[PDB]
Design a protein around this ligand. Sequence first.
Ligand SMILES: NC(=O)c1ccc[n+]([C@@H]2O[C@H](COP(=O)([O-])OP(=O)(O)OC[C@H]3O[C@@H](n4cnc5c(N)ncnc54)[C@H](O)[C@@H]3O)[C@@H](O)[C@H]2O)c1
Ligand SMILES: NC(=O)c1ccc[n+]([C@@H]2O[C@H](COP(=O)([O-])OP(=O)(O)OC[C@H]3O[C@@H](n4cnc5c(N)ncnc54)[C@H](O)[C@@H]3O)[C@@H](O)[C@H]2O)c1
Ligand SMILES: NC(=O)c1ccc[n+]([C@@H]2O[C@H](COP(=O)([O-])OP(=O)(O)OC[C@H]3O[C@@H](n4cnc5c(N)ncnc54)[C@H](O)[C@@H]3O)[C@@H](O)[C@H]2O)c1
Ligand SMILES: NC(=O)c1ccc[n+]([C@@H]2O[C@H](COP(=O)([O-])OP(=O)(O)OC[C@H]3O[C@@H](n4cnc5c(N)ncnc54)[C@H](O)[C@@H]3O)[C@@H](O)[C@H]2O)c1
Ligand SMILES: [Cl-]
Ligand SMILES: [Cl-]
Ligand SMILES: [Cl-]
Ligand SMILES: [Cl-]
Lengths: 272, 272, 272, 272
Amino acid sequence: IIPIPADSYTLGFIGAGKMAESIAKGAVRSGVLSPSRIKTAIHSNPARRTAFESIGITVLSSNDDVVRDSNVVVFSVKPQLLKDVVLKLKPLLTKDKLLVSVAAGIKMKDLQEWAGHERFIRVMPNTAATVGEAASVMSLGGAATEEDANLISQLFGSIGKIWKADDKYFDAITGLSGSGPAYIYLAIEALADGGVAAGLPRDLALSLASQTVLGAASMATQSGKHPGQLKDDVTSPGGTTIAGVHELEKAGFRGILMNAVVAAAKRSQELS
Amino acid sequence: IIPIPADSYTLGFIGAGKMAESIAKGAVRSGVLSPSRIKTAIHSNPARRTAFESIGITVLSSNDDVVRDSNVVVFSVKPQLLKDVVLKLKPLLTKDKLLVSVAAGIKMKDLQEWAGHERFIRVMPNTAATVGEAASVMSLGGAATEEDANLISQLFGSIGKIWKADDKYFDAITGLSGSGPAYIYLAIEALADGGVAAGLPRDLALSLASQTVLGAASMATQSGKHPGQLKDDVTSPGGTTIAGVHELEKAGFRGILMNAVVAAAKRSQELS
Amino acid sequence: IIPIPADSYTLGFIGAGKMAESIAKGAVRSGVLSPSRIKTAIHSNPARRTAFESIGITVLSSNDDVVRDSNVVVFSVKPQLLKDVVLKLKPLLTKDKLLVSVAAGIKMKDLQEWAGHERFIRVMPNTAATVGEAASVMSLGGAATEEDANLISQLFGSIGKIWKADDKYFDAITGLSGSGPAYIYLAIEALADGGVAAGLPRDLALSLASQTVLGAASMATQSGKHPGQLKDDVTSPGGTTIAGVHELEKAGFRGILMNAVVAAAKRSQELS
Amino acid sequence: IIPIPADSYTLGFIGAGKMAESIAKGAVRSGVLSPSRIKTAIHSNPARRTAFESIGITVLSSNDDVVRDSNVVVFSVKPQLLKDVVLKLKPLLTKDKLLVSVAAGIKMKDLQEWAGHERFIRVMPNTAATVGEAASVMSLGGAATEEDANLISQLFGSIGKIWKADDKYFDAITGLSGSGPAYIYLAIEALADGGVAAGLPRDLALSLASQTVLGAASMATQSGKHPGQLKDDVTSPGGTTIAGVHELEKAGFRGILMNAVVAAAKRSQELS
Ligand SMILES: NC(=O)c1ccc[n+]([C@@H]2O[C@H](COP(=O)([O-])OP(=O)(O)OC[C@H]3O[C@@H](n4cnc5c(N)ncnc54)[C@H](O)[C@@H]3O)[C@@H](O)[C@H]2O)c1
Ligand SMILES: NC(=O)c1ccc[n+]([C@@H]2O[C@H](COP(=O)([O-])OP(=O)(O)OC[C@H]3O[C@@H](n4cnc5c(N)ncnc54)[C@H](O)[C@@H]3O)[C@@H](O)[C@H]2O)c1
Ligand SMILES: NC(=O)c1ccc[n+]([C@@H]2O[C@H](COP(=O)([O-])OP(=O)(O)OC[C@H]3O[C@@H](n4cnc5c(N)ncnc54)[C@H](O)[C@@H]3O)[C@@H](O)[C@H]2O)c1
Ligand SMILES: NC(=O)c1ccc[n+]([C@@H]2O[C@H](COP(=O)([O-])OP(=O)(O)OC[C@H]3O[C@@H](n4cnc5c(N)ncnc54)[C@H](O)[C@@H]3O)[C@@H](O)[C@H]2O)c1
Ligand SMILES: [Cl-]
Ligand SMILES: [Cl-]
Ligand SMILES: [Cl-]
Ligand SMILES: [Cl-]
């Protein structure tokens, strides 16, 4: 377990997919990595080659070469393909290379078994990586060092926010930050529909819906306030806001969102 | 005649409130205005005076003086106080000065009647002005010019996004972008409570909830995609996301949000 | 595994039922097959004799002879009868003949085991085959070739649309395209009942209901748009459409249809 | 009242919109008339010019000229613009010219008052005009003749189906065939979501959903059967279909669609 050179390490992606692309772009954009320090290899899809090459990244001809040339290897294939991919690469997965998985639903215990060592970090990002606003969580394998963690924190800091948590929380994380964006997509559409139902033009209703949600979440992120206090701040006496909030409460809105997180988390567990 | 000099105009706030402060800070930060080009007056509050003075803004002793010294006058008092305030200032409200109201629920027909002329713009911003992420909409009085509009765009573009709409849409705008942030504060708290119900630590649950909402709304704002399509992009077959979405649909989640916007809009009309 | 001659192959139906009749009529109508290239046999209903004979198709006296004279054999008996039928014919089911099942709920693993070889394609069509608007899906056995697939694509393309999917999706397919037509028959009656409730004559209400459904689905099939975008296109501000849509959303309409598909898919699995 | 020559009349569109374009294309496609017998004029956008010119239709410079050159004039501007457009053209609206409105929500009494005569036909088409599957209904003004009606039937027969009804039914028509497509778009999306919830790939689920609806509506339109008979035909005993239909019936699916039509029809009346 030699420390990974924090300022000069090379990064490899196994699986040149959307998430790999988002991470690469973020890391380049933030200056955490240069394109020359990133490698990947292309599978069945040739559309992908151009996506990486156009960022200045070298696309190699095999996964094996990506691993050989990389200090840090990110596995970003679909979860059901990961075990076979790791097993095939295993002879190259020496302990001087930090391994990372972004695969949804694959536990650290399994990752470590497959690779044959514990210098492994699991991350669960989410779809907003594409715009640099991912909610990501990492868990550390048994031999991942504090410096390894910092390196991954910096890397995933370049596509959003990143927190640390024990692996046993990941089903619930998956139901909240992994699946949650869809809940909000429904909400944005419904808010827009609501605006139209109240007489707004569609384009304006949808623009307002998206920015309202963006603004409110920015307030929650930056204000240092409890969401209840934020709600209190905007509910003027007898006003329009409390009229709307009351309709939400009549319908058990909060409990419906709780139900969605719980059901998604339970599904995550069932798929394990 | 008498276009307002786009690069040198002076701006006055009548009502040195939170919203006035947010607009002033934004305009300064963006370089649209310098502090020396902004004036306000404080009705009673010492705390308010230090808030403006600490960003370099001169606090005068009367509303009358703010009006005299300003090319553009923003009325940012509470709506129930606005009529008397405008009536008292009326002799000073000459047609060479562009007037702006941010007052919730006050229609353009009334603003113009109170002032005695039609060189008036109404804006409805929202609470996210504080973090530069307002959703704002403007409507033009009968003598507001295109250059007047541009000036107001630039100004409210400094604190979020700004759109234009007919005054008749404003009750619905109020129920959507004005009131919507509370609906999202509920959502954020509920999502966090869900995460805790699913076994997450509270701090992590809340951090994830807020950033999940922020990221999803950023995807909606940047992607160019319909929210349906964004939901399609994240609902993998038989996966955790579609499980959660299905719970939301069982409960009529979308309709509840529609209800809230509709109720808030109807409250707006009733108050008007 | 000799290629089936694409332009001259003969087709045999085992089970001279309604589905067989719809496939035969389609294939003849489209010019994919001529009647002289199609054979079937009755076992114990001679009324079926006249239905094939009247479209110019020869009706043989035994299933055995249909098989001998055919390059492609379609099994269109009731599912609970299929195994014994295939077992009886087995000595004649040589690998030069492509086998096809349209039997609901019978998996490829079983088809192949019964026949003793893997040159087998499963199709799940639906009721709209009768009017050349089936939604069909095919899965390929282990020895079905790409050319076999193309042949079956062209055949079932004559009674509607035909997609390819893995056999493991067929319970869900059965709940959606197999059972879905009933959901829409309910919808059509309900829309007609709604029109009558709103004061329309029954004959007009039913005509409008059916054609409204037809037109909307044709839009969805041709437009290249997401259904949400299509909904957005027709929901004018504060207008009649959004008022109707809002009543759907209040009631959880979407979730009810999701429930139906999920229940039907589960039932399919249980009947497995 | 001079008959409009049936085989040589010229047709003018006032408002070179989407619906005008659909009608023009349909009529040219079906051979009802040649492009040389059609005229329109262009307003705010010159993008429209090319849409008409590219099908061989002459685009004139004024509404006035379109009217002068046309025996049959179709008004296809947005409803809120129609009154002023008709009043401006009124001196040219001589009784030898058959007038037609496709405007949503504009009653025959008003049309006739604006034009100053009763040789007017109202049509309510729907969004599926774009694919030639409109559900349309016409009503006759007090001086519209049987031959005028036949001419308009033939014309609107080119973009779908066309029925006749008294003007007093048009609110309800609007809530059913006018607004109904959105109810079906919801249904298509929800069906697809259901498929996905049951484990289907999204692309397949959406393809199946759309074609399932199309095919069921085609069965309703062509079979001659009551929808209840059609539902009986596919609900095999104890099978997947009846399981899904039972879930719909548990939830009051039929009533929800009735509610949508009734609400949309009431809204139509309220707007009128
Ligand atoms: N996309 C997201 O928003 C998101 C969020 C959280 C987690 N994840 C995880 O990220 C991973 C990928 O997600 P995606 O959306 O990037 O998938 P994707 O399908 O875009 O990329 C997958 C890539 O892997 C390639 N591949 C397949 N087999 C391979 C092999 N044997 N060797 C090398 N490459 C191979 C595929 O060709 C494809 O390019 C998954 O594990 C998913 O759970 C994604
Ligand atoms: N704050 C928001 O998020 C938000 C959003 C949309 C619209 N608005 C509109 O902004 C306006 C102000 O909102 P706020 O939240 O800034 O109010 P605020 O109460 O923080 O500040 C209002 C100021 O007006 C001062 N005032 C009272 N009487 C006065 C007078 N006669 N002359 C001069 N000043 C006087 C008060 O002392 C106070 O400082 C309201 O009309 C509100 O509807 C605010
Ligand atoms: N009908 C549809 O719309 C539809 C839709 C999807 C799938 N399918 C599948 O199509 C198949 C046939 O459906 P149908 O509706 O045509 O049935 P059907 O009953 O009309 O025809 C079945 C025929 O098989 C004959 N038969 C019974 N035992 C036989 C044997 N041993 N040898 C030869 N013929 C025999 C019967 O006399 C009957 O004529 C079924 O497996 C069904 O699941 C039908
Ligand atoms: N589009 C549909 O599916 C549908 C369905 C039912 C009824 N309708 C009715 O059809 C009519 C048009 O619908 P659309 O969707 O075609 O509208 P659209 O906006 O595409 O076309 C309207 C056209 O009118 C033009 N216009 C504006 N002012 C004008 C003027 N003074 N003189 C001439 N042209 C002018 C606009 O530039 C635009 O090109 C509306 O009345 C609508 O209710 C449409
Ligand atoms: Cl409020
Ligand atoms: Cl998922
Ligand atoms: Cl509408
Ligand atoms: Cl069934």
